């Protein structure tokens, strides 16, 4: 039938989606800026659709409750028909791939460690062998699931510690984890994706850093409900933008060009 405005679910996560200067006085998509705001515009252009950006109601990426079997976050919004597409730093994972469709990836990342500068930690193994410095992950996302599921000895040991630590080491948003690192005088380290870690490293007050190699290697993809007719065109659009160098230009624009911690 007739063309319809595509509902895009996304998440307020710097620098992917941020509230634009003077947003309270603005309406619709003009309220937002960031890597994924730019990426949504480019995809829409190449695919020939109009769209409305919406911020995911529960502020989550997406996990399936083992009791109720219900998905939350952006994944849930796709699964239950509340959005047509997710354009966000949404990690391609096995359990998600079973229930939604994903484009080829538009950005690579791995789990990484964020420390307050000077903290004597260089690796996951270092974290796992000490008790002076607490550490945790985001709730309802792929990093927490990575630890929950890992059979790798070091990561399994870390999960056994994290899942039972009191007070809780988990946070609801990336911003909360970053704030916890910054205020904890070296006594909290945060496990988060390299992309977000490297962004924060270039933001004032320039008091955090990424340490060690990444723990894994994966990608973010644009997601649609399983079988959605939008999927094929969106996937080709990602590959076209990749090949044109536009994704590289956007990463540079939002990570480094406006970095606040020097050249």
Ligand X SMILES: N[C@@H](CCC(=O)O)C(=O)O
Ligand Y SMILES: C[C@H]1CCCN(C(=O)c2ccc3nccnc3c2)C1
Ligand Z SMILES: C[C@@H]1CCCN(C(=O)c2ccc3nccnc3c2)C1
| 89 is an interface residue for ligand X by CB under 6 A | yes
CA atoms within 13 A on the CB side of 12: 14
- The least CB distance from residue 4 to ligand X, in Å, is 27
91 is in an annotated binding site: yes
Applying CB under 6 A, which of residues 15, 141, 221, 231 lies at the interface with ligand X? 141
| 174 is an interface residue for ligand Y by CB under 6 A | no
- The least CB distance from residue 217 to ligand Z, in Å, is 4
The values of phi and psi at residue 115, to 5°, are -125, 155
| 114 is an interface residue for ligand Y by CB under 6 A | no
Q: CA separation (Å) from 2 to 5, 49, 86, 142?
A: 10, 12, 22, 37
| 130 is an interface residue for ligand Z by CB under 6 A | no
67 class by beta-carbon count within 10 Å (0-12 exposed, 13-18 middle, 19+ buried)? exposed
The residue among 133 and 154 lying less far from ligand Y, judged by its C-beta, is 133
Pairwise CA distance, residues 34 & 86, whole Å: 15
Q: Residue 240, SS3?
A: helix
Contact 222, 106 (CB under 8 A): yes
Bridge partners (DSSP) of residue 134 are: 188
- Pull the structure tokens for residue 249: 């230009």
| 105 is an interface residue for ligand Z by CB under 6 A | yes
Applying CB under 6 A, which of residues 78, 83, 88, 107 lies at the interface with ligand Z? 107
Site for ligand Y in 31-90 (CB under 6 A): none
Residues in the annotated binding site: 89, 91, 96, 142-143, 193
Interface contacts to its own copies, rule CB under 8 A: 92-94, 97-98, 102, 104-105, 108, 146, 149-152, 216-219, 221, 235-236, 239-240, 242-245, 247-248
Interface contacts to ligand Z, rule CB under 6 A: 104-108, 217-219, 242, 247
């Amino acid at each position: 039938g007739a063309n319809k405005t595509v509902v895009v679910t996304t998440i307020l996560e710097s620098p992917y989606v941020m509230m634009k200067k003077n947003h309270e006085m603005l309406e619709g998509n003009e309220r937002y800026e960031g890597y994924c705001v730019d990426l949504a515009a480019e995809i829409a252009k190449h695919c020939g659709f109009k769209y409305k950006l919406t911020i995911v109601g529960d502020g989550k990426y997406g996990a399936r409750d083992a009791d109720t079997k219900i998905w939350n976050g952006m994944v849930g919004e796709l699964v239950y028909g509340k959005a047509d597409i997710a354009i966000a730093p949404l990690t391609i994972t096995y359990v998600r791939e079973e229930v939604i469709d994903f484009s080829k990836p538009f950005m690579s990342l791995g789990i990484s460690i964020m420390i307050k500068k000077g903290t004597p930690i260089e690796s996951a193994e270092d974290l796992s062998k000490q008790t002076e410095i607490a550490y945790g992950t985001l709730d309802s996302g792929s990093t927490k699931e990575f630890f929950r599921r890992s059979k790798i000895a070091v990561f399994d040991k870390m999960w056994t510690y994290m899942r039972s630590a009191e007070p809780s080491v988990f946070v609801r948003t990336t911003a909360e984890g970053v704030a916890r690192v910054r205020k904890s005088k070296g006594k909290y380290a945060y496990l988060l994706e390299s992309t977000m870690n490297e962004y924060i490293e270039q933001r004032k007050p320039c008091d955090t850093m990424k340490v060690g190699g990444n723990l894994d290697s994966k990608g973010y993809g644009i997601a649609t409900p399983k079988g959605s007719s939008l999927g094929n065109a969106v996937n080709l659009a990602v590959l076209k933008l990749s090949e044109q160098g536009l994704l590289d230009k956007l990463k540079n624009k939002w990570w480094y060009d406006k970095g606040e911690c020097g050249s």
